[PDB]
Symmetry: C5
Subunit: 205 residues, 5 copies
Amino acid sequence: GEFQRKLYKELVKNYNPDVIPTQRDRPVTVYFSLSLLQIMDVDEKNQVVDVVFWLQMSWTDHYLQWNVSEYPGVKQVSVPISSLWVPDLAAYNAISKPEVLTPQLALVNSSGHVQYLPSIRQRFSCDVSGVDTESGATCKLKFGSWTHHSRELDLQMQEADISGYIPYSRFELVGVTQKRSERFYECCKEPYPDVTFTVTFRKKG
Amino acid sequence: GEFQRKLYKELVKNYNPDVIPTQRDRPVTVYFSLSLLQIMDVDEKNQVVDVVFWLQMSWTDHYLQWNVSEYPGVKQVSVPISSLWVPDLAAYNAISKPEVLTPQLALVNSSGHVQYLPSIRQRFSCDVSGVDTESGATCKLKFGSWTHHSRELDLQMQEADISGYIPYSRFELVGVTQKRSERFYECCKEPYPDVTFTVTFRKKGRS
Amino acid sequence: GEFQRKLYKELVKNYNPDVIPTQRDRPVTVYFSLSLLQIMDVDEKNQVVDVVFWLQMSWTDHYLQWNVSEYPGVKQVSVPISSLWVPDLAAYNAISKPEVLTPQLALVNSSGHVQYLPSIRQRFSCDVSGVDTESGATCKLKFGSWTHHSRELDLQMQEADISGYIPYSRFELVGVTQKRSERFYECCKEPYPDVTFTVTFRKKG
Amino acid sequence: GEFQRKLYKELVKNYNPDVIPTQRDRPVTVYFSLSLLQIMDVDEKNQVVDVVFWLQMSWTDHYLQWNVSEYPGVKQVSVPISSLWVPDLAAYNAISKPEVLTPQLALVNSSGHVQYLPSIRQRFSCDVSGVDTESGATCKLKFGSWTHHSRELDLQMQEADISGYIPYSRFELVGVTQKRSERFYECCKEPYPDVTFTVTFRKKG
Amino acid sequence: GEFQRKLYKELVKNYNPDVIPTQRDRPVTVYFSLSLLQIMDVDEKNQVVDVVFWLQMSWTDHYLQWNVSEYPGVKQVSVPISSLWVPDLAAYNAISKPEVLTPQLALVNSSGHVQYLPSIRQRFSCDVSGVDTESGATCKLKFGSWTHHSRELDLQMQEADISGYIPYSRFELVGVTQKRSERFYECCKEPYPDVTFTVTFRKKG
Ligand SMILES: CN1[C@@H](CC(=O)c2ccccc2)CCC[C@H]1C[C@H](O)c1ccccc1
Ligand SMILES: CN1[C@@H](CC(=O)c2ccccc2)CCC[C@H]1C[C@H](O)c1ccccc1
Ligand SMILES: CN1[C@@H](CC(=O)c2ccccc2)CCC[C@H]1C[C@H](O)c1ccccc1
Ligand SMILES: CN1[C@@H](CC(=O)c2ccccc2)CCC[C@H]1C[C@H](O)c1ccccc1
Ligand SMILES: CN1[C@@H](CC(=O)c2ccccc2)CCC[C@H]1C[C@H](O)c1ccccc1
Ligand SMILES: O=C1C[C@@H](CCc2ccccc2)CN1
Ligand SMILES: O=C1C[C@@H](CCc2ccccc2)CN1
Ligand SMILES: O=C1C[C@@H](CCc2ccccc2)CN1
Ligand SMILES: O=C1C[C@@H](CCc2ccccc2)CN1
Ligand SMILES: O=C1C[C@@H](CCc2ccccc2)CN1
């Protein structure tokens, strides 16, 4: 409506989507979780797993807040992600670019909270040779910021989700785990956090 | 015409295609139907169906109206979708990005009714293991707004179409049903609607 | 060309490539030719034919005309098509997006006659089951405006043209017929013309 | 550096990369050569050859000159090709879009001489049926302007050799020729020049 | 943050990403190294190797420097590579475009030192006919500037890395060397440096 129209004019004014929305040297906290939907394929030769998954990501951008009293009815807006700052999360062991399956929009509410929930297909490097054993194969999907350390971008995970995994796949899901690590590199004194999702699966029968 | 050109210059003036055209607390009603054109392939190993279908979407955008008496002769205009708000409808169970096959333009008439009618190829997760049986395989093509709840974007469904299904495919179309649902999610305050097209089909040569 | 450079500055000024250049209730006539160059492949399982063809499309855009006396020497110019209104021609039974193989330019002369001549590869739905028989397979390649009716866009066809068919294909091009129809739809008062190119072909072996 | 920065501000001023930089009725002479690097594959069923080649293209853009003593040290610059007018050269018998393998930058020196030297992968229509015979298969890769005739764009060849042909492929070169022609087409009163690279090759062994 | 935002406004104002940041008598030194992460596939028929690798590239762009006291808290910023000058490094023997697997961002600090660390998947021409043998197959991945000679772009290599190579690939990484070379072409007075990465590998047994 007219109030959203006006809201967009205001927020866009000096907004720079290339600048991480830190304030007073405090990190932007980014919440992150992966829901595995489908294992599409495994390449036992080239050691690759092909997966479809749902990412849940959220963080606050203080430059995107407003008073609902100034914009009655407007509690949250749908925004193209290209028009706002987004975490530069990399899939560490991807061997293909992500194919984003869903509209590239984020949800923003009046306290500046952003929710971005893409469904994604992507291939990853993985030792899939256990895929026929009862042990099964174990694949790690590792994500983290490519250019921001812990003190700029504080990546945290939220509860994992398996309810969405399709039941009719030829791969059975035996276990999925999530953990947050902080790793140090010779380059820098600050750590870089990453969230790793560990999937254990096997062929049915 | 010269009047159509004047009309673009006005309909552009304060229009933001990123903003859903709700008015006065009222949701935008979006009518939606799918017509199955062809089942291109089934992947029995990976559980995927590859379909070409024609979507009919229409809604009213009250910011896109004009008096015909001011712009005489202009009953309607064809507008690239990137110049107007369009519903962020997503295929919930798709495993590939949609490939839009037709010009990305929408028809808009003087009372702001918009019609966007793309043809699309896309692949969906589906249990196709029964494709070789008499009862066939059943696939749910489930669509809904990715970000807009019911009270902003009121998704309604209109009468389907089977008449466009190509007769020479190796897949016999045994039926297509469509239903609108609406649920609450634990995440959010407002309910969300979706329209699901259920397609049952089998290989003509299954025996 | 200095005069050419001035002509571009001037022509752009009030030009809107989204506006069909009808004038005085008259439809824009669009001449449409298709020259089949090569049948790349047939998929007998999925019922698809993969073709390379040359489209010739011309029409007059009255907003693109100029006085040659004002721009001496400038009789025709070569212009990116993205800067011009172009007919929204759809391939009705295509199952892939068109791959345009040639520079995306159109010729425009001083009376505003545009010629756009892309070479295109594209896959179409087709019953190719008879391809190995003596009768061969028949594929219809159907095109028409997606959003403009007859009184706005008058699609006219030109000579059938088989001369570009490569002679070393494994497919023998029996013949190519063509027809224009004005189809009515329940939705609308006005008909929408389409041109259909019917291609009959068979394996040389 | 600083002089180069100042040069850009001047050069960009009225520059239109959509406008062929002719002058005084005279064409823009464009030199062209092709050096074949590798035949990647042949498709005997669909009659296609997949090649990687090196184009050497050069021409004079008279709007891109400057006095070197006005910009001391600046004798040539690397410019993205999207900023420049470039010849609208097409591969007449390509069946795929060209895949440019190298940075899209052209060298431009102070008298307006432009060199653009892309390495390209591309598939062409070709009768490759004789590939396993002694005489081999002969493919013609034909290039020319898509929209400019002889009197606007004077395409000339320069000599090339086969030095860059990779020696460890499964194909050997039996013959290579490269020639410029000037033909009339049914459409136009003006001749259009082309350059054709004719390669004859066969499977080793 | 507010100071990062003011920093972007300031830099953008005069920055030109098309100008190489040389100064009179000083080339831009560019540091370069390749870490092989995985050999995805070898094509023994067409002579291609498909590899995933991490490039580390750095250089100083004096135009990107700022005074830290004018921008307290801001020691470094993440910048989209498309906003800055980047070395035009080409893969000499690549037969496909690079597929960049990581966010296209570089780290820039207050001295104007730019670090760009992309993960890349790319296919190269290589004689892999020895891959099943004892001595294995040897591939040269050759990189260097496509258009800048030594006195403009001083390409230099740094310490290599094998640590990242995946231990579960079917290919056993035997040896890896890197060398910086300087080559003259008949065309040009000035030499063009390249860094070449030599990989020896074999199928596991
Ligand atoms: C990019 N790198 C850190 C920075 C850094 O290393 C670095 C910084 C500056 C100079 C040299 C190296 C930032 C956080 C991500 C990390 C990624 C890891 O390297 C990596 C690279 C390639 C494959 C897997 C993992
Ligand atoms: C996106 N989601 C609702 C929003 C929401 O969940 C949500 C919102 C905010 C926070 C956390 C979750 C809105 C309506 C669509 C629905 C989609 C479905 O989840 C879904 C997820 C993954 C694959 C298929 C379908
Ligand atoms: C799009 N349609 C006409 C418009 C219209 O139908 C229509 C208009 C408004 C409302 C509902 C339907 C315009 C001319 C093209 C025609 C196309 C055909 O439907 C069609 C759709 C999908 C595959 C093949 C053919
Ligand atoms: C494009 N065409 C000429 C232009 C022209 O014909 C033309 C001009 C104006 C109107 C109608 C046709 C210019 C020079 C190249 C020539 C190309 C060849 O036809 C051709 C067509 C299809 C595939 C391969 C080659
Ligand atoms: C582009 N070329 C040099 C310049 C130059 O040759 C050249 C310059 C001017 C005119 C003619 C040729 C610059 C440094 C890179 C070198 C590339 C090599 O040729 C080459 C070409 C094709 C595949 C692999 C390698
Ligand atoms: O804004 C975004 C997009 C989202 C994509 C996740 C991803 C990126 C690259 C490779 C794999 C997955 C992360 N943040
Ligand atoms: O925003 C849009 C895109 C257009 C296409 C419909 C679609 C989207 C996603 C998956 C399948 C189909 C409708 N509205
Ligand atoms: O401006 C244009 C492009 C031309 C393309 C024809 C086409 C469209 C869609 C599918 C296949 C071919 C039509 N008008
Ligand atoms: O500016 C340019 C691009 C270069 C590409 C040549 C080409 C085009 C189309 C198919 C094959 C090769 C020519 N001039
Ligand atoms: O311009 C660039 C791109 C970036 C990546 C290097 C590269 C280019 C082409 C093929 C492989 C790798 C460095 N500089």
